Design a protein around this ligand. Structure first.
Ligand code: K
Lengths: 120, 53, 327
RNA sequence: GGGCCACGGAAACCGCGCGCGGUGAUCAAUGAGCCGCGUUCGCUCCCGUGGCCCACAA
RNA sequence: GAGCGUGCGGUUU
């Protein structure tokens, strides 16, 4: 799997990520698309970044993990970009997604953040 | 863009899996490039990790 | 599968005793990096988006070059092989511009046609075609004839036809697809195009993206790592691989760089099958590109004779001080 | 004289397209629409000016 | 100046 995917993510954790975006969307604030997600991280407003595992070409999202580590922001992967798009509430695929305000999903976000900490 | 090619075979195809080698195909066109290149620095950090440099 | 530039060439020996002095000249992989660039060519994978001219304007500015020229212009939406010759190598493009090209194209048919028919009709387009350059054109919009060397259909998916095509320089691909559409009755247009080959420049490990090009430049400039950027740049000699060659003695080299025509007693080796008037590359025994020229004799005449002008020297690439003035 | 090399044989604005920054879309988030700013390579002849050579390889 | 190469097309001077 692609070289920008830095660690292995279990299906359960991956499902928790797609659920967290589902909730944070209507009850909080998210940003959807790679430019929006990237800005969020540079602006330091991203709480969690979710990156699709099937981005081609890689270069679309390849810069995110290093930029996240630079800004001290947690990131995690999900297998599908179409599925990540659906979660973001758009009818198109999304290569990456940022959570700016978690809303009714604060604890799930904090849970995700602490298990990817061991994987880092 | 619909044109794909197998990273193994080199075969051009419209399919997701190479009809020759059997490998997962990639989009044939290279990624878009900006002279401004906003994330070159961070892309370079990823690439340095990849290249053993 | 075959372009004219693919022909097999037998190297023939005139002077078996000719040796080269290792103190003289700079064979490709021995050139310090800065000299390498001075006499270099990039096998660029052009991205869709910018024009070919913009892409080179970016290359010049990022690599800090005074000059660079590209071969046959690719359209904004077209990706693929774009040779970019740098600095003192810029004029070698003239060996490229006229050489054959290959494309992978996706044609969209405007009506349903059986797969058997599509292959049949496209096969009929191999050979000469008459066309007029389109409105969006860098060239005089007059009628002209051009060769299609081959067409290979790779895949048909309903109304989409994916194919490879080999063509003479100056062949317009949109126009060709339009005429295939008319031959099929239903009409057609081109939805996607990629150049896979220009002369000696192919899709191999030398083919490099803008990203890798600028990144490797920075690894060199800013990290001190020479390896990657070095492989990013090809010696100008590459731009001459498809040409018939004659290899010359050390004692003829400086003269030729000073604009002497090449006489038979300067020849050490040559390719078989050179005819009068053919474009030839004049090489050192270290396989350095000295000059481009025009054959005044055939391969067999150069081989059989002991005096007379073998090659008219027209374009000199090698600096005058690489070999001593032995005359 | 000839050959070769170099330099010159237009500039400044405009558009289409493409990009960056901003915002971010009733299936283009791998970026819609809008705003602001950016944005186009050489070669061959030929002619002009200058430079190096005149070298059958010894 | 005249041309070439899949991309340019305008308006002043
Ligand atoms: K062409």
């Amino acid at each position: 799997k692609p070289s920008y995917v830095k660690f292995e993510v279990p299906k359960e954790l991956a499902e928790k990520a797609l659920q967290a975006v589902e909730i944070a969307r209507d009850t909080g604030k998210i940003r959807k698309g790679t430019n929006e997600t990237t800005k969020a991280v540079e602006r330091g407003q991203a709480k969690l970044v979710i990156i699709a595992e099937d981005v081609d070409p890689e270069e679309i999202v390849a810069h995110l993990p290093p930029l996240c580590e630079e800004k001290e922001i947690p990131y995690i992967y999900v297998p599908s970009k179409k599925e990540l798009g659906a979660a973001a509430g758009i009818e198109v695929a999304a290569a990456s997604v940022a959570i700016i305000e978690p809303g009714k999903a604060r604890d799930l976000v904090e849970e995700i953040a602490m298990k990817v900490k061991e994987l880092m | 863009f619909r044109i794909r090619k197998c990273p193994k075979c080199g075969r051009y195809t419209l399919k997701e899996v190479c009809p020759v080698c059997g490998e997962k195909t990639k989009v044939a066109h290279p990624p878009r490039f900006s002279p401004e290149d906003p994330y070159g620095e961070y892309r370079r950090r990823w690439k340095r990790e990849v290249l053993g440099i | 599968r075959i372009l004219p530039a693919d022909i097999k060439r037998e190297v023939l020996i005139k002077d078996e005793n000719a040796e080269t002095n290792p103190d003289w000249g700079f064979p490709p992989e021995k050139r310090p990096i800065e000299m390498h660039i001075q006499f270099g060519v990039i096998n660029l994978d052009k991205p869709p988006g910018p024009t070919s001219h913009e892409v080179v304007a970016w290359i010049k500015k990022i690599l800090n070059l005074e000059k660079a020229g590209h071969g046959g212009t690719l359209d904004p939406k077209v990706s693929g092989v774009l040779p970019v010759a740098l600095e003192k190598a810029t004029r070698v493009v003239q060996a490229l511009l006229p050489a054959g090209k290959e494309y992978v194209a996706l044609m969209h048919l405007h009506g349903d046609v059986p797969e058997d028919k599509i292959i049949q009709v496209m096969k009929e387009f191999e050979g000469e075609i008459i066309q007029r350059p389109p409105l969006r054109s860098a060239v005089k919009r007059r009628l002209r004839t051009r060769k299609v060397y081959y067409i290979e259909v790779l895949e048909i998916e309903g109304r989409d036809v994916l194919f490879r095509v080999g063509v003479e320089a100056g062949t317009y691909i949109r126009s060709l697809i339009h005429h295939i559409g008319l031959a099929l009755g239903v009409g057609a247009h081109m939805s996607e195009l990629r150049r896979t080959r220009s002369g000696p420049f192919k899709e191999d490990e030398t083919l490099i993206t803008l990203h890798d090009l600028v990144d490797y430049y920075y690894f060199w400039k800013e990290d001190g790592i020479e390896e990657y950027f070095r492989k990013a740049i090809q010696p100008m000699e590459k731009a001459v691989e498809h040409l018939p060659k004659v290899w010359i003695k050390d004692s003829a080299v400086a003269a030729v760089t000073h604009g002497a025509d090449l006489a038979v007693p300067g020849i050490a080796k040559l390719h078989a099958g050179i005819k009068r008037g053919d474009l030839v590359a004049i090489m050192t025994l270290k396989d350095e590109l000295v000059a481009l020229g025009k054959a005044m004799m055939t391969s067999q005449e150069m081989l059989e004779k002991t005096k007379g002008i073998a090659v008219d020297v027209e374009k000199v690439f090698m600096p005058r001080d690489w070999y001593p003035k032995l005359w």
